[PDB]
Amino acid sequence: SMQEEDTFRELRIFLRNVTHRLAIDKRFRVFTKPVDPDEVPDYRTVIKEPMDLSSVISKIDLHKYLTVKDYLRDIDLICSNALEYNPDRDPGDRLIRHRACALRDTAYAIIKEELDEDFEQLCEEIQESR
Ligand SMILES: COCCN1C(=O)N[C@@](CCO)(Cc2ccc(F)cc2)C1=O
């Protein structure tokens, strides 16, 4: 229905706002663009499913996310890709892992504080019905 399409547009507007707040945070600058194959050719071979905040904005605009649960899976992937590719005892690696964990924790805390559980439940029920 038109009503359900309005509900999904509402969800996309909220997801664009959360993603913009993460992308302007100086800590998360490394997560704002895909890894440049020139600089890191080792990456696309170690990392099977690359994800960054620019690509998240792309997935929202293409209607790939119908639930907050769907969105958070891609946040979790940004974080899990950084921890798996930078596991070394080495300050540079420790710094990116701390920032990746802070990105994940921030996104979960915004959604916990701001979004009503009944709105997510609604978005899920429309998804399941299709
Ligand atoms: C927006 O769509 C979901 C409906 N909704 C919520 O889930 N929490 C609030 C308030 C509780 O009523 C607040 C809020 C407003 C705008 C948002 F983008 C996000 C959250 C709300 O208005």
Swiss-Prot record:
Ranges where the Bromo domain occurs: 3-114
Q: What sections of the sequence does the record tag as coiled-coil?
A: 108-130
**Organism of provenance:** Homo sapiens
Tissue expression remark: Highly expressed in estrogen receptor positive breast tumors and in osteosarcoma tumors.
Q: What's this protein's function?
A: May be a transcriptional coactivator of the nuclear receptor ESR1 required to induce the expression of a subset of estradiol target genes, such as CCND1, MYC and E2F1. May play a role in the recruitment or occupancy of CREBBP at some ESR1 target gene promoters. May be required for histone hyperacetylation. Involved in the estrogen-induced cell proliferation and cell cycle progression of breast cancer cells.
Its family? Belongs to the AAA ATPase family.
Q: List the disulfide bonds.
A: none
Please report the name of this protein according to its UniProt entry.
ATPase family AAA domain-containing protein 2
Induction statement: Up-regulated in breast, uterus, colon, ovary, and stomach tumors. Induced in breast cancer cells overexpressing NCOA3 or treated with estrogen. Down-regulated in 5-fluorouracil-resistant derivatives of the colon cancer cell line HCT 116.
Q: Which domain of life is it from?
A: Eukaryota
Where, per UniProt, does this protein localize? Answer: Nucleus
Q: What is the annotated quaternary arrangement, including any partners?
A: Interacts with ESR1 and NCOA3 and these interactions are enhanced by estradiol. Interacts with acetylated lysine residues on histone H1.4, H2A, H2B and H3 (in vitro).
Q: Which gene encodes it?
A: ATAD2
